[PDB]
Design a protein around this ligand. Structure first.
Ligand SMILES: Nc1ncnc2c1ncn2[C@@H]1O[C@H](COP(=O)(O)OP(=O)(O)O)[C@@H](O)[C@H]1O
Ligand code: VO4
Ligand SMILES: [Mg+2]
Length: 761
């Protein structure tokens, strides 16, 4: 389904640069000119398609062109349109012959759509946008990922012979890393479900493909067997995709030339704790629960006291079975994938005992009481007490101590303590927060246990970076988690434009700036409205959290007044008290605030942490390990969002250092169906992944760039301080290039996409 909002957002992107020169010099009009048009009942009746192909009929003027619809099959009726609505077509070409869009004569919106389409439906998804690699999602296994296809890339000697691929950007990066001994990073970008995880899995498998049979299994073995476990605990079924990464994945990898992983680092960030507690309908919790509850052996089941996937209140009993997902099979895989991380039969037994714990604690009914002369007072339900006692046993903590930290408010004046009781609402809020913590920190501990065996003896010098972020998400409900997810993405988009469209624009201005006709990404306007310390959505949520009386509406009002003067922040038209639109790269995204404060405050702290700290089980002790208690008033550092900004900014800054290798995934249709083309949903991504500009300004702009000394070296016969500047201009005028093809800069020689190719004989 394509929203009329997705239709609007895509219709804005529609731009007409080049003119339709479709008339024979004399007259009679050019004989059968293929063009594109926004006008046709075939565009009106269909939302999936935006343009039809037409043949320019003989006897039309440059005011109204009589055109007949060729593709899609037209009623054969010639209709008249203004040249304003006619784009130049890449008349008679074979989209399969060349694996780079750069070779296209015209690279207008309709032409890139038809080019990527005539490939996607032909089952060639990957194309080079230069630098970028556009990798569409065909939803079906193509088999162009296999060890056979891996070998074919790594071992094949010539780099030009190699067609566009994920493996193309894997060798491209691995070669530079070993050759120029500079640490390189692979950026995976697109929608939440466009192909990030898949490409990341593929490129990992590629670096795990060894030529030599010498290297130690241990490190590589554990790293690859981490991916299935990481997904069990870190991925869940969504309305957008049935395996959505609810954590941002980052890797640092030491891979020796002969395709072997010597060392690695696994860092996951920002887990979705609101997954474990509740799930949207049609949506689900983290795979692990389901896999466990199903494929658990007779004994585990009885020992833990496991029930059905329906019988656990934390897990939605309607959305339990995933369309085309066999949870028992994946569980079996997840169990071996754990052993293959140096986790013993006991270590596993514990992981699942805690998991069984979280579930069992989430079935405990808390109730209201008139108790201790407090009323509204927290008290565990009489019957559900047995549940709670095993629930704690399973987590390996004292039940009556967890019972004491929930149900009892503990305050301090001076060096002296004051008792008091927790209320039903707040006790339930705390009971939930215990589960959230246990889960988040167990996953984090498994990541820590993996890193303790895989990380380098010393540290990381030159490594291979890989980023499996959570892509842009749009629904009906858009919470703080959904806001964080879209903030993360916006950073990975400015990271890109600063490297791809800014270093360029600077170098032109530093030498010979040809066009003021360049980049289209005003990501700075939206990255500031969201992160800029003091004045931003996050900074007015940060301040509001540490405020005494801080309401969700109080935070909304501060943005609706302070950030008003900006176009990127738009307040809601209806229910303006709660909702607000943030005009993203992918377009207008609206957030219903509500709980925003408590969600940013959703982090376990206090004397409660200390209970888990001195647990009998060591894994449970280690579960928190490095934790600053404070037991009271919250800090700026302890805030969920405020920690995330620090986390993203720090990690992103390491990436800006390493060599950027961009992979751009496109989701062709929401329908989760192979070989289905929805032009508007795609067009939005062509704009956001900046693909339709990263070719407009690469082909229109100068692509060579070499200093006088570099240029004059290839023409050996010549050799000089200001004279060698004029020496280069000669070689060019002699070779045959027009004064438009080349440009002479303050220190270098710029040569166009087409020009630079001439001098290569
Ligand atoms: N190149 C591909 N070939 C086949 N299926 C793919 C491909 N890329 C993605 N998919 C499918 O699309 C699903 C959603 O993509 P996913 O791996 O979760 O990436 P992301 O991190 O963007 O969500 C995958 O689980 C897989 O079924
Ligand atoms: O769907 V994602 O794995 O990109 O979050
Ligand atoms: Mg993922």
């Amino acid at each position: 389904a394509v929203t009329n909002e997705e239709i609007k957002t895509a219709s804005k992107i529609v731009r007409r640069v080049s003119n339709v020169e479709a008339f024979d010099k004399s007259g009679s009009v050019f004989k059968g000119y293929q063009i594109w048009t926004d006008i046709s009942p075939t565009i009106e009746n269909d939302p999936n398609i935006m343009f039809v192909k037409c043949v320019v009929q003989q006897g039309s003027k440059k005011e109204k062109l009589t055109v007949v619809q060729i593709d899609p099959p037209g009623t054969g009726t010639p209709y008249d349109i203004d040249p304003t609505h006619a784009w130049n077509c890449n008349s008679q070409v074979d989209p399969m012959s060349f694996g780079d869009i750069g070779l296209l004569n015209h690279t207008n919106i309709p032409c890139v759509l038809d080019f990527l389409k005539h490939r996607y439906l032909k089952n060639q998804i990957y194309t080079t946008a230069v630098p970028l690699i556009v990798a569409i999602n065909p939803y079906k296994d193509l088999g162009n990922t296999t060890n056979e296809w891996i070998r074919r890339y790594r071992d094949t000697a010539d780099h030009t012979k190699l067609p566009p691929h994920v493996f193309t950007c894997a060798r491209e990066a691995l070669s530079n890393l070993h050759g120029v001994n500079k640490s390189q990073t692979i950026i995976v970008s697109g929608e939440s479900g466009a192909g990030k995880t898949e490409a990341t899995k593929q490129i990992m498998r590629y670096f795990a493909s060894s030529k030599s049979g010498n290297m130690d299994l241990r490190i590589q073995t554990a790293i690859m067997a981490a991916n299935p476990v990481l997904e069990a605990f870190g991925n869940a079924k969504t309305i957008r995709n049935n395996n959505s990464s609810r954590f941002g994945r980052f890797m640092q990898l030491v891979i020796s030339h002969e395709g072997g992983i010597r060392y690695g680092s696994v860092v996951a960030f920002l887990l979705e704790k609101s997954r474990i507690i509740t799930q949207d309908d049609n949506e689900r919790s983290y795979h692990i629960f389901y896999q466990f509850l199903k494929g658990a052996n007779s004994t585990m089941k009885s020992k833990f006291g496991l029930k059905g996937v329906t019988e656990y209140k934390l897990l939605n009993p309607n959305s339990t079975e995933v369309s085309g997902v066999d949870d028992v099979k994946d569980f079996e895989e997840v169990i071996e994938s754990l052993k293959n991380m140096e986790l013993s039969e006991s270590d596993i037994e514990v992981i699942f005992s805690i998991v069984a714990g979280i579930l069992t604690l989430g079935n405990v009914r808390l109730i209201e009481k008139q108790e201790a002369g407090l009323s509204d007072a927290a008290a565990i339900m009489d019957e559900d007490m047995g549940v709670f006692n095993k629930a704690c046993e399973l987590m390996y903590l004292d039940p009556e101590l967890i019972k004491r930290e929930i149900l009892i408010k503990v305050t301090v004046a001076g060096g002296t303590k004051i008792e008091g009781r927790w209320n039903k609402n707040d006790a339930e809020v705390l009971k939930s927060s215990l589960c959230k913590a246990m889960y988040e920190k167990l996953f984090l501990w498994i990541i820590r246990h993996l890193n303790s065996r895989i990380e380098p003896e010393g540290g990381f010098k030159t490594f291979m970076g890989m980023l499996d972020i959570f892509g842009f998400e749009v629904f009906k409900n858009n919470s703080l988690e959904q806001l964080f997810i879209n903030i993360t993405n916006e950073m990975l988009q400015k990271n890109f434009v600063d490297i791809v469209f800014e270093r360029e624009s600077k170098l032109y201005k530093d030498e010979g700036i040809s066009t003021a006709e360049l980049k289209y990404t005003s990501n700075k306007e939206v990255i500031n409205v969201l992160c800029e310390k003091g004045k931003s959505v996050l900074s007015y949520l940060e301040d509001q959290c540490l405020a005494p009386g801080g309401t969700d509406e109080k935070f909304v009002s501060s943005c609706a007044t302070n950030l008003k003067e900006n176009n990127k922040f738009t307040p809601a038209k209806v229910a303006s008290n709660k909702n607000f639109i943030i005009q993203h790269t992918i377009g207008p995204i609206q957030y219903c605030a509500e709980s925003f404060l408590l969600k940013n405050k959703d982090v376990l702290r206090g004397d409660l942490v200390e209970v888990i700290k001195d647990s009998p089980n060591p894994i449970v002790q280690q579960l928190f390990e490095g934790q600053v208690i404070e037991k009271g008033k919250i800090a700026k550092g302890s805030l969920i969002g405020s920690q995330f900004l620090n986390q993203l900014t720090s990690l992103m800054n390491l990436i800006n250092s390493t060599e950027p290798h961009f992979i751009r995934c496109i989701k062709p249709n929401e329908n989760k169906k192979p070989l289905e083309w929805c032009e508007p949903k795609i067009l939005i991504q062509l704009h956001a992944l900046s693909i339709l500009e990263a070719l407009v300004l690469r082909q229109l702009g100068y692509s060579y760039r070499r200093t006088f000394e570099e240029f004059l070296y290839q023409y050996k016969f010549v050799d000089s301080s200001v004279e060698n500047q004029n020496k280069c201009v000669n070689i060019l005028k002699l070779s045959g290039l027009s004064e438009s093809m080349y440009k002479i800069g303050k220190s270098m020689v710029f040569l166009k996409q087409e020009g630079a190719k001439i001098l290569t004989k």
